[PDB]
């Protein structure tokens, strides 16, 4: 059975910098697609950004030059990172990993981060 | 026999099939290039792999029981026989170290493409490289343990006659034996300028 | 007679080769419960590989006395 | 091709017969046999070849050349079925065949010796060893050959071979059994030569076939002369005894049937070359062995063919015919005629 | 003084004897107890039947042949021989002492043949009462038969052979023709033929029939297949009456055969106590003659010209006894001996004691060597065992095969004296190799970081892992340092471990094997100097080490190179190594990536350098003989050592990839058998648990010792020799020499000698 979970979540302080971490295990193939998505309180998700197997980067608008997403050295870890919060960035946070054709798709627990 | 039967049959059945198609135009149809150009090319390489030390490994063992049982049939009344024939059985060996050793060499060729370009130019070429070049070493190893077997046992049966015989027959194994090398060669060749999966 | 010496060996190496590993895992030593399929709990496992120790004891002593007799 | 597929079964086999090969005695070591003036010296000279220690057992004063002939001849029979011990399939079909040939000698001496009121304890230690069977000393119960066919030979692997026998008088006799024998012999080797061309692979079929050839003729040629020694035969029925499969049929043996004298018999074997010179000179049997020899010989130099082991066969036997020849010689010490042995090695 | 012919060979002299017929019998019974000289035939040329002392060979042979007919008297019985007694003339130790006078010969003759007379006509009395024994005894089985037997004259029967039986019964079907009433009975105890000493399962018969003309033919037939006939009458009083005579010659013949039976066995248990002294005597008189018929004979002097190999180191002794010899026996003589010298070819002799012994065997199974060229046995003593090990890498085996060993050297003493089963000596002949090869397999499998298939943490790894992971996260290591000895135990359990161990082993093999070949080959060159032959040395020795060096030396200076740099930090792509040499010669001149400076001029230069030692090697030896038609096997010769000179350089550096295969293969076993039955047993609780636990361990130690020991370790052991007898001795090793082989005296068996 595949897992995955998240890290990094917490409260800061009004434009300050703050990385998210995670993982996923139980699976021995690198998943094709990674990707981050939000949820404030009283809305639906919101995609953030995603990362190809081959290092291609894909960002939402809103963050677009102050978050910044990456793979890390083995395999299936990922990275999120953002340079400045603000009060609209807080919301819970969550992984996602996926498969090129079928129903394998994969989606973590979640973290939340308050400025 | 039933079996000869089966052949004709088959036969006949593919040429009424490929005269429909061709009648009825639909000639087109059986389009053997977009088969040989779709099929994943995993398939040729790791077939070829398989092959090539399965073959070689049928030829040396071949030769073995060829030369061996002739060896022990001969040595009952001249167990002298025994300690210096091995050679024959050397020879016949080695067949399939060179078939582990092209193992070794094809089998850094087997990274994994992305899918973007797994039917591209480069890639298709290792594979049908590996495949051919794979025959060719697992057939002519597997042709070379046969001839130097036959020779290891009419060695073995001379030898036991008088012991000056040996070193005349012994020339012929060389030459059988260069077969080997030969196979070897041009395996190396014809898959030396094939790239690594991309 | 030969018909003790086997299972007096078999029974020696029992001992000493049962106990070490008891030991190992007593002490959660890394080649033994490091990894995620290991067993979760060193001491629980210790302790029945450590019985198992004790039964071959017993075989060593009652097949050497009938060999030394 | 050839070897690929021999050794799965007979690998062994050719070795260890190519073994016995080596042991055949050469020109060299007849010669030193020729130089012995007793066989208790024989016996002595014998023991370095081959043949080792196989008289070990023999008092000096029980020496005689029925003796050595008979421990030199047990010699071969141990080694012939010890080979087809090992053997399975169509190579252990191949060495009964060979084997059918003497029990059908045994059966006609058996009731030669029966129909002269013979003890049958006397018979049966001249009886070949090789051609043994079961039931072999019951054809000493009657002389009816209808009575002894239903009692007896319906049981053995002989019984094809009486398709043409039965049309006898009630009552056999030394002549009318010797028309059953070679009327056996005729069925014989044409079913050997049948078998061999169905079963056997190259090389070893044309080997044979020319082989089981040679002593087709042979059979042939030693008919025609002793039918000679008869008032009469009706050519019609010698015709039958003469079998199908030889270099000399069907042209030379037509003539050689209708033939009438020694004048004759020449005139028609004047036509075939392989044996263009054999009746002006020397003695006419010794020219038969000579030539079977140059046969064995030749087969030899093939590999990885089963009619090695006839070859054998028939070369080990030539030489206790030499061996017992000088034997002979040393005993009755006539010994100008000494240097008559046969051997190419 | 002794020199140590263990190096080379011990040196050879040649002497010839001149002793007097008078003293010759007592003189070469003192050579026989020497066992130090090998004599050679002088007169090879004259008929065995020629030979001068054929008739007092024939003498002593008759009497072997009885004193073999004696002995299977014996074992025809019960009776057994009294044994021992083996070291009453020599401990072996070649001590002097005096043989048996010719009266006592003569006796033994005249008492063997005396003892045949009698067994003979004893024997054969003996048996003739037994076929009457026999013969009443399955009569009265018949008449014992019960009625109902003879309910349904008005029959025929008797005894037959139980195989036979099937037969009689369709032959007298078929001549019946279908009118047959048959009834058969069998009988519980084999019974024995004395024409065959080989026992039957008989069977009784009988039929019915009233017309006199059938039942002469029945009789007929069952005589036929050696049935025995009996006479019976109908009614039951004459059956009564005649049960009753049987009986009493019966109960009479049983006096006949205990009085003469008891009479023979007492004769056999006298020559019994003798006979094998007898034959150890007789024995010893045949060969002292054989040597002697070897000799020349002298008409024109009483005197005898023999001629024998001694080793010139022991030559002192031969001549101090055989003046004890004229001390004993006062004849006066002259000189006996003279040393001579000859263009002969003398034998090989090499000293071994309890520790050498197992691995010379191990050479002279191969070939005797050639006279003082250099003896493979010492390089074998390390190189075997090692080459062994290498492969058969791991502590755990190796410490219970060393443990077999120390069981079986500590011992020795008393295991020498016991008989010995065929497989175990073979074991106990190896004692020492065993052991050697057991406790160079713990030093190896340390540097392989395994026992049993599990690592060893002593020193601390070179290898740090990350901080902080979460359970289940992959994770990789950076490096620290290097490990002091052997293998880094961070490798273990590592999923991409086996990329990095076969990277090890396989450039472990092809050094080793490098090494081995070029060790063994300066050997050659040791010959060479010592033979003063210097065409040799610029015809063979200095063109095969250029081209054997400016190969496979070059490629094994390239992997032992590129370890000592530091690619990564360097910034350069590390070359790959099956390219380069491919390139070397498939395409010269030409580099993918660079090794070294230069790299491309000197890659080039060595091909040329490799190329033109070939006619070098080919043209320069024959050359130099048609300076001075026989000088076309010279030519001949040379060119089949060229051809194959070149092609087995490549094949025997490519077969010792084998030491990296058998090590691979050793190891995953190992894996799997712990994984598959120690593993499981982790998993159970409580008193289940532990009879799971007591129950697998057997499972595990069984397997382990049954394959992964005797089986691996022979596959393994075997596999040592073949790099011995092929790869490596083949560069520097002769062979075809002449084994040293002393006439002596021995114990015979006297179950050999009649087998």
């Known amino acids: 059975q595949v897992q995955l979970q998240e890290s990094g979540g917490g409260l800061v302080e009004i434009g300050g910098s703050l990385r998210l971490s995670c993982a996923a295990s139980g699976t021995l193939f690198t998943f094709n697609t990674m990707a981050w998505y939000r949820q404030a309180p009283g809305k639906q998700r919101e995609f953030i950004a995603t990362?190809?197997?081959?290092?291609?980067?894909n960002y939402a608008d809103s963050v677009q030059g102050r978050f910044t997403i990456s793979r890390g050295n083995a395999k299936n870890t990922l990275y999120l990172q953002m340079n400045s919060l603000k009060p609209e960035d807080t919301a819970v946070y969550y992984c996602?990993?996926?498969?090129?054709?079928?129903?394998?798709?994969?989606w973590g627990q979640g973290t939340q981060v308050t400025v | 026999s039933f079996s000869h039967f089966l052949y004709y049959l088959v036969l006949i059945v593919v040429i009424v099939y490929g005269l429909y198609k061709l009648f009825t135009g639909h000639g087109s149809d059986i389009n053997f290039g977009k088969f040989l150009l779709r099929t994943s090319p995993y398939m040729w390489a790791n077939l070829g792999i398989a092959l090539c030390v399965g073959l070689s490994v049928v030829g040396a063992a071949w030769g073995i029981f060829i030369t061996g049982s002739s060896m022990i049939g001969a040595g009952v009344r001249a167990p002298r026989i025994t300690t210096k024939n091995l050679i024959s059985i050397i020879f016949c060996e080695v067949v399939a170290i060179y078939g582990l050793i092209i193992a070794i060499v094809f089998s850094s060729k087997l990274t994994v493409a992305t899918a973007e370009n797994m039917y591209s130019k480069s890639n298709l070429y290792t594979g049908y490289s590996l495949f051919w070049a794979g025959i060719t070493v697992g057939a002519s190893n597997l042709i070379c343990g046969i001839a130097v077997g036959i020779t290891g046992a009419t060695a073995a049966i001379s030898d036991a006659a008088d012991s000056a015989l040996f070193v005349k027959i012994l020339v012929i194994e060389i030459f059988g034996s260069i077969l080997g090398l030969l196979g070897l060669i041009v395996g190396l060749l014809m898959a030396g300028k094939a790239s690594e999966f991309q | 007679t030969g018909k003790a010496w086997c299972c007096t060996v078999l029974s020696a190496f029992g001992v000493v080769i049962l106990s070490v590993i008891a030991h190992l895992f007593n002490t959660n030593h890394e080649s033994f419960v490091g990894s995620i399929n290991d067993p979760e709990d060193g001491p629980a496992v210790a302790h029945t590989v450590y019985l198992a120790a004790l039964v071959y004891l017993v075989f060593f002593v009652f097949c050497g006395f009938q060999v030394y007799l | 091709m050839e070897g690929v597929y021999f050794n799965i079964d007979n690998g062994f086999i050719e070795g260890v017969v190519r073994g016995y090969r080596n042991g055949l005695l050469s020109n060299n070591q007849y010669i030193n046999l020729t130089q012995c003036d007793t066989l208790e010296d024989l016996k002595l000279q014998l023991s370095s070849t081959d043949y080792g220690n196989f008289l070990s057992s023999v008092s000096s004063e029980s020496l005689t050349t029925s003796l050595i002939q008979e421990y030199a001849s047990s010699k071969l029979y141990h080694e012939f079925n010890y080979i087809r011990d090992q053997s399975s399939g169509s190579t252990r079909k191949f060495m009964d065949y060979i084997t059918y040939g003497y029990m059908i000698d045994n059966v006609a001496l058996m009731i030669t010796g029966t129909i002269h009121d013979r003890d049958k304890g006397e018979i049966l230690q001249r009886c070949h060893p090789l051609g043994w069977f079961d039931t072999l000393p019951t054809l000493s119960v009657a002389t009816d050959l209808e009575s002894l066919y239903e009692t007896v030979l319906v049981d053995t692997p002989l019984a094809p071979y009486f398709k043409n026998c039965f049309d006898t008088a009630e009552e056999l006799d030394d002549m009318n059994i010797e028309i059953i024998r070679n009327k056996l012999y005729k069925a014989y080797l044409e079913d050997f030569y049948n078998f061999v061309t169905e079963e056997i692979p190259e090389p070893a079929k044309e080997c044979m076939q020319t082989l089981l050839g040679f002593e087709a003729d042979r059979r042939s040629i030693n008919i025609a002369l002793n039918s000679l020694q008869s008032s009469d035969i009706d050519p019609d029925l010698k015709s039958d005894l003469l079998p199908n499969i030889g270099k000399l049929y069907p042209l030379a043996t037509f003539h050689l049937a209708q033939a009438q004298d020694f004048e004759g018999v020449r005139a028609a074997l004047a036509n075939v070359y392989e044996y263009r010179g054999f009746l002006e000179t020397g003695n006419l049997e010794d020219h038969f062995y000579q030539l079977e020899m140059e046969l064995c010989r030749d087969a030899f130099t093939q590999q990885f063919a089963i009619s090695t082991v006839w070859a054998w066969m028939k070369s080990k036997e030539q030489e206790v015919r030499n061996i017992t020849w000088i034997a002979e010689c040393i005993a009755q010490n006539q010994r100008e005629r000494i240097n008559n042995y046969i051997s190419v090695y | 003084e002794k020199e140590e012919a263990i190096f080379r060979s011990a040196e050879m002299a040649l002497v010839q004897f001149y002793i007097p017929q008078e003293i010759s019998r007592d003189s070469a019974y003192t050579l026989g107890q020497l066992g130090l000289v090998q004599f050679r035939d002088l007169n090879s040329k004259v008929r065995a039947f020629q030979r001068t002392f054929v008739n007092e060979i024939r003498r002593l042979d008759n009497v072997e042949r009885q004193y073999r007919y004696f002995y299977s008297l014996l074992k025809k019985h019960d009776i057994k021989l009294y044994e021992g007694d083996t070291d009453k003339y020599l401990d072996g130790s070649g001590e002097l002492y005096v043989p048996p006078s010719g009266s006592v010969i003569d006796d033994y003759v005249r008492n063997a043949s005396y003892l045949e007379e009698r067994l003979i006509q004893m024997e054969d009395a003996t048996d003739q009462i037994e076929v009457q024994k026999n013969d009443l005894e399955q009569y009265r089985f018949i008449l014992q038969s019960g009625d109902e037997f003879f309910l349904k004259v008005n029959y025929v029967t008797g005894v037959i052979a139980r195989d036979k039986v099937a037969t009689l019964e369709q032959i007298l079907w078929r001549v019946l023709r279908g009118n047959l009433f048959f009834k058969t009975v069998e009988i519980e105890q084999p019974v024995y033929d004395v024409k065959t000493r080989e026992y039957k399962h008989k069977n009784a018969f009988i039929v019915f029939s009233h017309g006199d003309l059938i039942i002469k033919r029945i009789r007929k037939i069952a005589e036929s297949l050696d049935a025995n006939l009996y006479d019976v009458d109908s009614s039951n009083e004459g059956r009564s009456q005649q049960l009753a005579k049987v009986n009493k010659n019966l109960s009479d013949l049983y006096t006949v055969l205990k009085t003469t039976s008891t009479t023979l066995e007492s004769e056999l248990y006298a020559i019994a106590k003798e006979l094998d002294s007898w034959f150890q005597d007789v024995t010893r008189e045949k060969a002292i003659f054989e040597i002697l018929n070897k000799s020349n004979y002298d008409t024109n002097r009483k005197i005898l010209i023999a001629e024998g190999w001694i080793p010139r180191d022991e030559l002192a002794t031969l001549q101090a006894r055989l003046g004890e010899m004229i001390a004993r026996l006062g004849i006066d003589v002259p000189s006996i001996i003279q040393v001579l010298d000859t263009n002969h070819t003398p034998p090989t002799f090499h000293r071994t004691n309890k520790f050498t012994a197992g691995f010379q065997s191990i050479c002279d199974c191969y070939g005797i060597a050639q006279y003082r060229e250099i003896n493979a046995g010492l390089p074998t003593i390390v190189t075997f065992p090692f080459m062994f090990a290498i492969m058969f890498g791991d502590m755990g085996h190796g410490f219970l095969m060393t443990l077999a060993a120390l069981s079986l050297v500590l011992n020795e003493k008393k295991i020498n004296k016991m008989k010995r089963g065929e497989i175990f000596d073979m074991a106990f002949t190896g004692r020492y190799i065993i052991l050697l090869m057991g406790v160079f397999s713990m030093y190896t499998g340390f540097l392989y970081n395994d026992i049993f298939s599990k690592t060893m943490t002593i020193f601390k790894s070179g290898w740090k892992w990350p901080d902080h992971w979460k359970k289940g996260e992959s994770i990789t290591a950076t490096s620290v340092g290097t490990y002091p000895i052997g293998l880094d135990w961070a490798w273990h359990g590592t999923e991409n471990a086996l990329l990095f161990s076969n990277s090890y082993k396989m450039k472990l093999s092809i050094l080793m094997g490098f090494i081995h070949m070029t060790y063994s080959y300066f050997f050659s060159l040791a010959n060479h100097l010592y033979f003063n032959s210097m065409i040799d040395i610029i015809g063979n020795f200095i063109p095969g080490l250029l081209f054997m060096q400016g190969i496979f030396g070059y490629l094994s200076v390239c992997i032992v190179y590129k370890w000592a740099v530091d690619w990564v930090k360097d910034g350069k792509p590390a070359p790959g190594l099956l390219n380069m040499l491919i390139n070397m010669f498939l395409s010269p001149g030409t580099i993918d990536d660079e090794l070294y400076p230069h790299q491309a001029k000197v890659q080039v230069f060595l091909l040329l350098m490799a190329l033109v030692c070939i006619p070098w090697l080919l043209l320069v030896k024959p050359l130099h003989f048609k300076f001075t038609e026989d000088f076309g096997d010279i030519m001949i010769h040379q060119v089949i050592h060229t051809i194959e000179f070149c092609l087995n350089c490549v094949s025997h550096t490519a077969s010792y990839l084998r030491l990296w295969a058998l090590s691979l293969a050793h190891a995953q076993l190992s894996s799997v058998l712990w994984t598959m039955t120690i593993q499981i047993a982790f998993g159970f609780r409580g008193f289940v648990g532990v009879f799971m636990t007591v129950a697998l361990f057997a499972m595990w130690f069984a397997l382990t010792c049954a394959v992964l020991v005797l089986m691996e370790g022979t596959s393994a052991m075997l596999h040592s020799l073949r790099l011995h007898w092929v790869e490596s001795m083949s560069k520097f090793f002769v062979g075809e020499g002449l084994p040293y082989e002393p006439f002596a005296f021995e114990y015979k068996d006297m179950e050999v000698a009649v087998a």
């Open positions: 996602n990993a996926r498969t090129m054709t079928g129903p394998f798709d994969y």
């Open positions: 990362i190809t197997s081959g290092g291609n980067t």
